[model samples]
Target: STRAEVCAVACAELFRDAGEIMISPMTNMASVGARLARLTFAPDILLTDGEAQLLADTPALGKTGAPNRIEGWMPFGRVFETLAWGRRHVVMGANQVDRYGNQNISAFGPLQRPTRQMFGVRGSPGNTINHATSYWVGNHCKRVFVEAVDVVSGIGYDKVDPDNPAFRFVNVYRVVSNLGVFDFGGPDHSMRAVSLHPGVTPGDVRDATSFEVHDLDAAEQTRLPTDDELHLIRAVIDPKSLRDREIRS
Candidate 1:
């Protein structure tokens, strides 16, 4: 199988046992993974068409306009309301994430005047503190996985204040990438390798990450898609192979 398939399966596994909830994926690979999860294990999971309508049937990434298949309408305000409800697991894309799980997508340098200004800290602050949140990185490299992010868009475990009841729902679940699967469950909630993709050496992860990806040696190889899942991924969810664009073979 191709790396894209392996990565998609890995991504799908992230939502295992996730009960009926809104699955909001921000990228192509994650979109495929979310749909795969909905079609398989988490059958009750709800999906949106990137617009306001809830999809009754799974649609491909770019082909998400199933007017007749839309079951309900979730307007922009309603989408924001799901955060506090804690019934959503959103797979957000991160420009850079550190060992402590502090994410960055806002800017590169100083917060005041960054060398390169990216998207400002949008919904990340609210997302991390409200419900389950995960990250999807198309590339796993030293530049992407660093010791500390220039800007803290998403609140990591490091910043969670036990004293403050406001942060009680902060849950940085997992970080899935092209090369491996990770979680911020290490000492003091630092990022740790849970599994690596097939054919990806430990050295590959070590070289790509600027900081240590704890428990890499102990991490097992990520499983490939089963025959049934392969059929679902190929025939139903992503027949056009759009996953390849997110993570190359």
Candidate 2:
């Protein structure tokens, strides 16, 4: 199977027991995985087409087609209501993520004089603080997984302000990249490698990350999609193979 497919399945698995919550993925591959989860095991997982409409049907990837049947209206204003209620799970893309799970998609370099600026933090701060949050990194390397993020757009374990009660609502769930899956599941909330993708090793993940990452006691290769999921991904959800383009070998 392709690396994209592997990452997609890994993304879906992040929501395994996330009952009746929103499955909001910020990137294409992660979006496909979110829908795949709803279509297969996690039927109660809700999804919008990353727009104003909540979809009753999982829309096809990449191309526009017949309008998806709208299940409900979920405009930007209402999304925060769900978010504040802790009823959502989002898999967002990260320009940089640190060991504590702090994510940066804002400017890079010194905050006052950034070398580059991307999407200006959008809703990441609120999202990370209010509900379950995960991330996808198409490129898993030292630059993307850093010792410290240039900007703290999304709160990580280390930065959670103990004085604020709202910080208790934050949960940095997982980080899935082309090479492996990571989580802040270690003692003191350090980043830990829960699994490595096929042909990827602990050393590979270590070399790619800027900070130390712990391995699970029995870290295993990321599981391949079941025959059913593989068929769904290839035959139905991503028939155009859009997911395949996200990560290149």
Candidate 3:
């Protein structure tokens, strides 16, 4: 299997036990993972058709037809209500991330004038401090993993205020990258390498980051997809294998 398939399976595993929450996945691989999760282990996870209605069926990744089955209606206002009230989990893309899982997709330089400016702190603050949120990075390297994020668009554990009331519900859950899977499961919610992808040494992970990634030695190898999952990914979800374009193996 290609690395994209490896990554898709890894992404799917992130929501293995998500229960009954609504999942909003951004990016190709993550969307595949969301559908994969709903199709298999986590059928209870709700998905939207990118419109208003809840999808009664888990459609394939990309280039699929409209859904024949539909359920509850969720407009933008209702969706915002869910995210604000801790009923959603979003797999957000990261421009840069720190060891504490501080994500930056806003900008690259100082506030006044930045070297690069991207989407600025859209819904990260509420999504983060309200409920569990995850991250997905198709490419993991030194430049992307920084000692500190230039901007703290997404709150991390280190930034969690003991005094602020929002700290109670904050959770920067799992992070899925091309090299491995990680989480803030370390001491005081620092980063811990949960697993390394095949052929990825802990040293490789270490070299790719500016800060230390905890528990590299103890991280298990990232698992391969089951036969059923492989079949879903290859033939059902992404028949044209568009997932390969994102991260080639």
Model 2 lDDT, residue 112, Cα = 87
| lDDT per residue (tens digit) for residues 1-249 in model 1 | 778898888788878988988988888888889999988888988999888999898765576455448889988789899877889898899999999988898989998888998889888888888988889898898989998899999989889888999988998899989998999878989889998989998899999999988899999998888998898888888888998888643
TM-score of 2: 0.95
Which 10-residue window in model 1 sums to the lowest lDDT? Answer: 59-68
Candidate 2 stretches with Cα past 4 Å from truth are: 216-218
Q: Which stretches of candidate 3 lie over 4 Å from their true place?
A: 64-68
Q: What does candidate 2's lDDT look like per residue over 17-51, in tens digits?
A: 98988888888888888878888878898888778
Q: What is the lDDT of residue 174 in candidate 3?
A: 89
What's the lDDT for residue 168 in model 1? 89
In terms of TM-score, the best-performing candidate is: 1
Q: What clash pairs does model 3 have?
A: none
lDDT of 3 by residue, 1-249 (tens): 767888899889878878999998877888888888989999999988777889888766666566458889989899899987888889899999988989999999997799999999988888888888899887788888998899998999998889888589987898888899999988878889999989899998998888888899889999988899999998888888778776734
The residue-level lDDT of candidate 2 at 66 comes to: 78
Of models 1 and 3, which has the larger lDDT?
1
